[PDB]
Design an enzyme around this catalytic site. Sequence first.
Site, short mmCIF file in Angstrom:
data_model
loop_
_atom_site.label_atom_id
_atom_site.label_comp_id
_atom_site.label_asym_id
_atom_site.label_seq_id
_atom_site.Cartn_x
_atom_site.Cartn_y
_atom_site.Cartn_z
N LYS A 1 -18.46 -75.08 -56.03
CA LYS A 1 -17.04 -75.23 -56.17
C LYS A 1 -16.80 -76.55 -56.81
O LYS A 1 -15.85 -76.52 -57.83
CB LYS A 1 -16.21 -74.93 -54.82
CG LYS A 1 -16.25 -73.86 -54.44
CD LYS A 1 -15.71 -73.72 -52.80
CE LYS A 1 -15.74 -72.06 -52.35
NZ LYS A 1 -17.23 -71.54 -52.71
N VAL B 1 5.65 -77.38 -40.23
CA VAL B 1 6.89 -77.58 -39.62
C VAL B 1 6.31 -78.01 -38.24
O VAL B 1 5.30 -77.31 -37.72
CB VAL B 1 7.85 -76.52 -39.14
CG1 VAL B 1 8.96 -76.88 -38.33
CG2 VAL B 1 8.35 -76.13 -40.56
#
EC number: 2.7.7.7
Length: 322
Positions: free
Chosen positions: A63, A94
């Site tokens: 990657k 949140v």
Amino acid sequence: TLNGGITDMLTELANFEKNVSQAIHKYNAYRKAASVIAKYPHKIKSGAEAKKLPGVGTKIAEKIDEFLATGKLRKLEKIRQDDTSSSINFLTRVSGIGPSAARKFVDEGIKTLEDLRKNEDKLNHHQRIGLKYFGDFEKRIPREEMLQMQDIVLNEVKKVDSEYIATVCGSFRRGAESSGDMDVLLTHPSFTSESTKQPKLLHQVVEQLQKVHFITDTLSKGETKFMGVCQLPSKNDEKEYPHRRIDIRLIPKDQYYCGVLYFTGSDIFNKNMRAHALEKGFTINEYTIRPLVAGEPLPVDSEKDIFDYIQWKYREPKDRSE
DNA sequence: CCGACGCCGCATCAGC
DNA sequence: GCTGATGCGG
DNA sequence: GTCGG
Ligand SMILES: Nc1ccn([C@H]2C[C@H](O)[C@@H](COP(=O)(O)OP(=O)(O)OP(=O)(O)O)O2)c(=O)n1
Ligand SMILES: [Ca+2]
Ligand SMILES: [Ca+2]
């Protein structure tokens, strides 16, 4: 920022594995790769060069090879395209909503901020606070502000009882110019490993910080840990400061150096040190360093002593920001 | 190949 | 009510 | 996902 794009990419893969897959170990793997690449002092020229570091293995090699070639990562372009993954990701930003609640929520139709604002109905108290101040908590804190906060906390703690010592830890003690939130280590003579000579020691301090309107909300509150919300006072006519997350940990006074080591971090520094402890035959938590199942705590007079045990040179706070 | 991946406080839950 | 598991965030 | 043994 020598390899900022590589570490960004690894960070967000880690985020995805934590939040979407609920794969805590692939999150640690990815974040360990990110860490060791962030302190590497050359521009990474290849995945092969990258795999030479501990924690970059074959899969992150390929990657890294893809990303320098093209400046992007197919696996991530499609993780960003999936409406379900990108919304569970957002929900975990949140405070109080993690991978489990985030996934449950989208399964109920809830995937925007607006959906949360309509259905505060469906949130426990923490998640309500997390929503209430969602944008404030997204903000960072400049060290100048951290300083004002620390002068408030320390001056207010002295008014309660002069034998309190409060130390601000986290990224601030490491010298960062900006902190994610504030972290306060408290000690008092009356509370050691041996006895608890007084009740309410943490309570009295939080109480006083509430009285002068420094602390505004309580996410959770026990004998030794407080996680809540504070805010600097603002002058006449000015906009109000952002509300800020605050954590107070009451640590027995003879375990200060283990507490301040834990609480100075960073998280990844803590994890590598404790995992290196495990190889020297030790285990470190925030109270003790014990030999190896655990035996009896060894004497600790300083932060360096903990380092000396696992055969590490001492590392000043500023150099622990992994 | 494979275990084993740092350690813990508080909130909440299901089981009793 | 507790106890232990689970979730969350430190 | 990585790694030491
Ligand atoms: N998984 C974690 C998270 C945190 N900590 C410890 C080390 C951290 O430094 C300290 C405070 O947690 P923070 O999230 O506030 O970490 P920081 O202060 O380093 O980062 P920030 O600048 O975002 O506040 O607690 C830890 O040991 N393990
Ligand atoms: Ca912090
Ligand atoms: Ca914190």
